[PDB]
Amino acid sequence: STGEYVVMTTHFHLKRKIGYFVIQTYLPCIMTVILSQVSFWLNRESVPARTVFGVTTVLTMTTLSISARNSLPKVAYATAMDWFIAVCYAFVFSALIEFATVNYFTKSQPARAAKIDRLSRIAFPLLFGIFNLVYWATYL
Amino acid sequence: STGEYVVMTTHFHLKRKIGYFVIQTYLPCIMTVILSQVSFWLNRESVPARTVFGVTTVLTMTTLSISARNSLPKVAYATAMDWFIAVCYAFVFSALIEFATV
Amino acid sequence: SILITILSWVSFWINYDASAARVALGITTVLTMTTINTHLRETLPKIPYVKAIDMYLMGCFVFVFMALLEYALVNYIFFSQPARAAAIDRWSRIFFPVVFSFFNIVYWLYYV
Amino acid sequence: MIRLHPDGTVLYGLRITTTAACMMDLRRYPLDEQNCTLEIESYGYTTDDIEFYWRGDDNAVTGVTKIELPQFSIVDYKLITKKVVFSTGSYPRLSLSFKLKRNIGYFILQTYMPSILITILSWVSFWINYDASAARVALGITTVLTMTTINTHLRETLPKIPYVKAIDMYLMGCFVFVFMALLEYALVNYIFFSQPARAAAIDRWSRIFFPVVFSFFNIVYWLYYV
Amino acid sequence: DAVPARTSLGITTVLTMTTLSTIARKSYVTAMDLFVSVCFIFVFSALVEYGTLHYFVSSQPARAAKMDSYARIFFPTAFCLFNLVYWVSYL
Ligand SMILES: *[C@@H]1O[C@H](CO)[C@@H](O[C@@H]2O[C@H](CO)[C@@H](O[C@@H]3O[C@H](CO)[C@@H](O)[C@H](O)[C@@H]3O)[C@H](O)[C@H]2NC(C)=O)[C@H](O)[C@H]1NC(C)=O
C-alpha cells in the first residue's frame, strides 16, 4: 500500500525421513491385512472363532487409523496415507461382508460357501499385492 | 493489623444450565434402568438370554458412569449427581440378584 | 449411527423360533450405540451446551430402544396368539424404515 | 549484587533461570547416557579483549551432589575452556557438561517383563501332548494377539520419538519368537497327517532348540547395551 | 450350546474395555496405564478361548468339558496372581 519495498528471500529445503512411518503404520497395516487371510482358510462352520478374528482385525485397524490421522494435521484434501488406510479398511470390511454372507449361504447349500472361499482365497491377496505394486511405484 | 480500610463489594449471581446434562447423562440412565426392567417379561426358560440381558445393562451403566464422572471437577465431598448415579447403578444389581434367586 | 440403526433393523427378518439370536442383537446394538456416542463425545470440541449432532445421536438411541421394546412385546404376547405377532413383524418391517427416513428428511431439511 | 573491594576487584552476581536446549540421542533408549551441556561465551569482545577462566577449578561449580532428578542421576560433570572462531573474530568460551543416566529399574517391571512372560508362556505349548490340538492352538493365538496388543499400547505410551529405538528391536524379537512358534505348530499339524514320526521328531527338536536360542538371544542383547 | 449369547457377551466386554481405555489414557509408562491393559488382555483371551472351543468341538467332545474345567479354576488363579505381583510392587 505504501510503496515499492525490497525483499530478501531465503528458501530452506527440507525432506521428510521415511524410515519411521514404514515400521510404524504401513508395515503393521500390511501385516494385519495379510493376517486377516486366516479367516478364509478356517472351517466354514465355526462362527465364533472367525467373529473373534474379524473383531480383532477391526479393532486394530481403528486404533491404528486414529493415531495415524492424529499425527498429521487436519486438511481438506486426503493425504497419500489416507488412501493406504482406506484400502486396508476396504479389504478388511470386504472380508467381513464375505464372512457375513457365507454364514447365511452355508446353510442352504455347502457347495456355494465352498466355491466362495475357493474364489476369495486367490482373489483377495493377489489384489492387495497388485495394489502395493501400483502404490509404492509412483511416489518414489 | 494496619487499620480500618473501606471496601466496596459486588456480587454477580450465576445459575448453571441443565439442558445439556439432561440429554447427556440423566436420560441415558433412565433409559438403561427401563431397559434393565424389561428382563422380567422374558421367558424364564431361556436362561442364557436373560443372563446376557442382565449383564449388558451393568456394562452400559459402567460405561455411562465413567463417561459422565470425568467432566466433574475434583471435590472432597460427594456431588448431587453422584447419588443419582449410585442409585441408577444399584437398581441394575438389584434386578440381577433378583434373576439369580429366581 | 445409521449403520447401527440398519443393523438393528436386520434383526426383524429372523424367525421368532431362534429368539436368543435376536435378543443378543437387540442388546448388542444398544450397547454399541452407547459406546459410539461416548467415544464421539470426546474427539468433538468440548462445548457444554446442546448441539444438533447430540440430538441426532439421541434420536438413533431412541430408535434402537423402541425396536428392542417392540421385540420384547412380541416375544411376550406370541404364546397366546400367533397371528398378532405374525402381523406385527410384517408391519414393523415396513414401518420402521419409513419413519426413520421421514425423520431424517425433516432433520436435513431443517438443519442444512 | 555489586561488591567493590579496596584493590578494585568488582564482583557481579545474578540469579538466572535458563531453559537451555541439549541434544538427546535416543537410539539406545531407554538404556542410554545423555550428555547435556551449557555453553558460555562473550559476545562483543574478541579474544584480544577479554579472557574467561574458571576461578578455583576444583570448586568452580558447587551444589551438584544435592541435585536429584526424579528420573535421571548426575553421574559426573567436567569443565572445559576453548577459543571459538566465527567469521568476525576469535571469541572465548567456557563449557559445563554433565552426564545423565536413566533408572532402568523403573522401566524393567513396567515394560519388559510382560513380553518375557508371554514368550515363556508360548513354550508350555510343547509340553502338552500333540494329540490335543485345541490346547496348543488356543495358546498360540492368545500369545500372538497378546504380544500384538502389548506392543501397540507400549509403543503408544512411550514419548513421541520419530526415529527407531531399541525397545522396538526387543519387542520385534519376542514377536518373531512367538510367531515362529505358532508357525512351527502350524507346520507340525500339516506334516502329522502325512506321517507321525516326522511330526514327533520336529516337535522334540524344537523343544530342545528354543530355550537355548532364547537364552542366547537375551545374553547377546543384554551384553551389548549394558 | 448357546452360540449367540457367549459371543455377544465377549464382544460387549471388549467394546467396554475399548471405551474404558480411550477414557483412561487421557486422564515413560505410568503404573496406572499398565493395569488397565491386562484387563483387556484377559477379557479378550476369554473370547479367544471360546472361539477355540467352538472350533475344536467336533473332534474331541470330552476335551471341551475338560477345557471349561481348567479355565473356570485357572482364570481366578491368574487374576489373583497378577494382583499379587502388581500391588506388592506398589508398596
Ligand atoms: C560431552 O561432549 C563434549 C564434546 O566432546 C565433551 O567435551 C570434551 O571433553 C574432553 C575432555 O573432557 C575434551 O578433551 C580435551 O581436549 C583438549 C584438546 O587440546 C586437551 O588439551 C584436553 O586435555 C582434553 O583431552 C574435548 O576437547 C571436549 N570436546 C569439546 C568439543 O569441547 C564432554 O566431556 C562430554 N561430557 C562429559 C561428561 O564427558
Swiss-Prot record, chain B:
What keywords are annotated for this sequence in UniProt?
Cell membrane, Chloride, Chloride channel, Cytoplasmic vesicle, Disease variant, Disulfide bond, Epilepsy, Glycoprotein, Ion channel, Ion transport, Ligand-gated ion channel, Membrane, Postsynaptic cell membrane, Receptor, Signal, Synapse, Transmembrane, Transmembrane helix, Transport
Per the record, its GO cellular-component terms are: chloride channel complex; cytoplasmic vesicle membrane; dendrite membrane; dendritic spine; GABA receptor complex; GABA-A receptor complex; GABA-ergic synapse; plasma membrane
Domain topic, free-text comment: The extracellular domain contributes to synaptic contact formation. The GABA-binding pockets are located at the interface between neighboring alpha and beta subunits.
Describe its partners and assembly state.
Heteropentamer, formed by a combination of alpha (GABRA1-6), beta (GABRB1-3), gamma (GABRG1-3), delta (GABRD), epsilon (GABRE), rho (GABRR1-3), pi (GABRP) and theta (GABRQ) subunits, each subunit exhibiting distinct physiological and pharmacological properties. Interacts with UBQLN1. Interacts with TRAK1. Interacts with KIF21B. Identified in a complex of 720 kDa composed of LHFPL4, NLGN2, GABRA1, GABRB2, GABRG2 and GABRB3. Interacts with LHFPL4. Interacts with NLGN2. Interacts with SHISA7; interaction leads regulation of GABAAR trafficking, channel deactivation kinetics and pharmacology.
Molecular function terms, GO-annotated:
GABA-A receptor activity; GABA-gated chloride ion channel activity; transmitter-gated monoatomic ion channel activity involved in regulation of postsynaptic membrane potential
Q: What is its main location?
A: membrane
Show the stretches that span the lipid bilayer. 22-42, 48-69, 80-101
The full protein's residues present here are: 233 to 334 of 456
Gene Ontology biological process terms from the UniProt entry: chloride transmembrane transport; gamma-aminobutyric acid signaling pathway; inhibitory synapse assembly; synaptic transmission, GABAergic
Q: Which residues does the record give as 3alpha-hydroxy-5alpha-pregnan-11,20-dione binding sites?
A: W41
Q: Which residues form a coiled coil?
A: none
Give the source's domain of life in one word: Eukaryota
Task: From the Swiss-Prot or TrEMBL record, give the protein name.
Answer: Gamma-aminobutyric acid receptor subunit alpha-1
Q: Which residues lie on this side of the membrane: Cytoplasmic?
A: 43-47
The answer to whether UniProt assigns keyword Repeat to this entry is no
From Swiss-Prot, chain C:
Impact upon substituting T35P: In IECEE2; loss of localization to the cell membrane; retained intracellularly it affects the cell surface expression of the GABA receptor; decreased GABA receptor activity
Q: Where are the transmembrane segments?
A: 21-40, 59-79, 92-112
- UniProt tissue specificity: Isoform 1 and isoform 2 show reduced expression in schizophrenic brain. Isoform 3 shows increased expression in schizophrenic and bipolar disorder brains while isoform 4 shows reduced expression.
State the similarity comment: Belongs to the ligand-gated ion channel (TC 1.A.9) family. Gamma-aminobutyric acid receptor (TC 1.A.9.5) subfamily. GABRB2 sub-subfamily.
Q: Which disease is this protein implicated in?
A: Epileptic encephalopathy, infantile or early childhood, 2: A form of epileptic encephalopathy, a heterogeneous group of severe childhood onset epilepsies characterized by refractory seizures, neurodevelopmental impairment, and poor prognosis. Development is normal prior to seizure onset, after which cognitive and motor delays become apparent. IECEE2 is an autosomal dominant condition with variable age at seizure onset, ranging from early infancy to 6 years.
- Role summary: Beta subunit of the heteropentameric ligand-gated chloride channel gated by gamma-aminobutyric acid (GABA), a major inhibitory neurotransmitter in the brain. GABA-gated chloride channels, also named GABA(A) receptors (GABAAR), consist of five subunits arranged around a central pore and contain GABA active binding site(s) located at the alpha and beta subunit interface(s). When activated by GABA, GABAARs selectively allow the flow of chloride anions across the cell membrane down their electrochemical gradient.
Q: What is the protein name stated in its UniProt record?
A: Gamma-aminobutyric acid receptor subunit beta-2
Q: Which organism is it from?
A: Homo sapiens (Human)
Name of the coding gene? GABRB2
Q: Which residues of the full protein are shown?
A: 253 to 511 of 512
Curated annotation (Swiss-Prot), chain E:
Side of membrane Cytoplasmic, spans: 1-4
Q: Which residues form a coiled coil?
A: none
Q: What happens after mutating R25W?
A: In DEE74; does not affect protein abundance; decreases cell surface expression; decreases current amplitude in response to GABA; increases zinc sensitivity; accelerates deactivation
Where on the tree of life does the source sit, at the highest rank? Eukaryota
Q: List locations, semicolon-separated.
A: Postsynaptic cell membrane; Cell membrane; Cell projection, Dendrite; Cytoplasmic vesicle membrane
Membrane-crossing ranges are: 5-24, 32-56, 70-90
Record PTM text: Palmitoylated by ZDHHC3/GODZ; required for the accumulation of GABA(A) receptors at the postsynaptic membrane of inhibitory GABAergic synapses.
Q: Which disease is it linked to?
A: Developmental and epileptic encephalopathy 74: A form of epileptic encephalopathy, a heterogeneous group of severe early-onset epilepsies characterized by refractory seizures, neurodevelopmental impairment, and poor prognosis. Development is normal prior to seizure onset, after which cognitive and motor delays become apparent. DEE74 is an autosomal dominant form with onset in the first year of life.
Please give the subunit comment from the record.
Heteropentamer, formed by a combination of alpha (GABRA1-6), beta (GABRB1-3), gamma (GABRG1-3), delta (GABRD), epsilon (GABRE), rho (GABRR1-3), pi (GABRP) and theta (GABRQ) chains, each subunit exhibiting distinct physiological and pharmacological properties. Interacts with GABARAP. Interacts with KIF21B. Identified in a complex of 720 kDa composed of LHFPL4, NLGN2, GABRA1, GABRB2, GABRG2 and GABRB3. Interacts with LHFPL4. Interacts with SHISA7; interaction leads to the regulation of GABA(A) receptor trafficking, channel deactivation kinetics and pharmacology.
Name the protein family.
Answer: Belongs to the ligand-gated ion channel (TC 1.A.9) family. Gamma-aminobutyric acid receptor (TC 1.A.9.5) subfamily. GABRG2 sub-subfamily.
Anything noted about its domains? The extracellular domain contributes to synaptic contact formation.
Identify the species of origin. Answer: Homo sapiens
Gene expressing this chain: GABRG2
